[PDB]
Amino acid sequence: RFRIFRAEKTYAVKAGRWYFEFEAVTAGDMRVGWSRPGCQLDLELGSDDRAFAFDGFKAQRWHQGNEHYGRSWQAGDVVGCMVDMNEHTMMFTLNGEILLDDSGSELAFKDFDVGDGFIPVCSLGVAQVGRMNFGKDVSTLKYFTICGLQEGYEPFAVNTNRDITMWLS
Ligand SMILES: [K+]
């Protein structure tokens, strides 16, 4: 079966600009993007409203269906995943280069509802190897300084270092 990896749902982002990387170690059937929290992702990623995904196998963008977008990865390529939760846009880079849809737009997805926010997600097909890097050690990100850093995006790990919550009785 397919393996779905997702950030812990308690770390979903509802504002700000966020970045993570996905290394396609193999070059086959994998998808990577942003998932709504607490939803069940038993379907193919982004076939419904539960996620927004880049399919680097077939060069498609997936949200409530598919359209051509970007280009396919080669083994060892790194996808950068960016979400601006205030402008309601998502962008992807492949080895630092911004991917475009057929209209020439860099907005992979736009005008989406914030809802309960988003967490990084990826799906790996049979025998596929793909690694999400949230950048806890920012120096392990490969393309953040090329595209992401100057644009004001924060590594997703910045939102996951806190492990304590507080409330008033
Ligand atoms: K943590």
Side-chain angles (χ1 to χ4, degrees), residues 3-39 41-125 127-141 143-169:
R3 291 158 288 153
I4 311 291
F5 298 84
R6 206 160 69 164
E8 287 283 353
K9 85 183 76 156
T10 194
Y11 292 128
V13 293
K14 294 176 67 173
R17 290 130 289 281
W18 297 97
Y19 181 90
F20 71 98
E21 280 177 5
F22 175 77
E23 183 188 9
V25 179
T26 53
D29 183 6
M30 303 172 285
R31 299 186 185 180
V32 62
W34 301 93
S35 168
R36 306 205 180 272
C39 303
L41 304 168
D42 311 298
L43 279 299
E44 303 232 53
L45 203 55
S47 63
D48 53 17
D49 186 27
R50 290 152 175 74
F52 296 75
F54 173 57
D55 160 15
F57 185 40
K58 306 225 205 342
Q60 297 179 123
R61 63 176 171 201
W62 282 90
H63 177 247
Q64 305 175 20
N66 58 307
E67 295 181 11
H68 179 254
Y69 162 84
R71 58 177 197 274
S72 293
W73 41 49
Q74 286 282 352
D77 283 354
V78 177
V79 177
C81 306
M82 273 153 286
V83 62
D84 187 328
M85 295 298 295
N86 295 86
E87 292 300 322
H88 314 135
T89 62
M90 288 163 184
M91 302 186 296
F92 296 90
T93 56
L94 189 63
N95 298 335
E97 173 196 349
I98 296 177
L99 300 172
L100 308 176
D101 70 19
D102 284 346
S103 77
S105 176
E106 84 280 14
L107 305 181
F109 306 100
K110 66 192 171 174
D111 301 319
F112 45 79
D113 191 347
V114 155
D116 305 313
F118 292 122
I119 56 200
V121 62
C122 66
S123 66
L124 308 189
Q128 292 310 298
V129 186
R131 294 199 283 261
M132 280 189 305
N133 185 3
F134 297 166
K136 194 170 185 177
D137 181 358
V138 71
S139 74
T140 66
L141 296 173
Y143 293 100
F144 182 53
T145 65
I146 283 87
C147 184
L149 175 55
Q150 273 333 280
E151 289 76 18
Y153 290 80
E154 297 271 3
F156 185 77
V158 166
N159 207 46
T160 68
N161 288 315
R162 180 193 52 75
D163 51 22
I164 288 171
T165 68
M166 186 209 62
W167 64 96
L168 299 183
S169 180

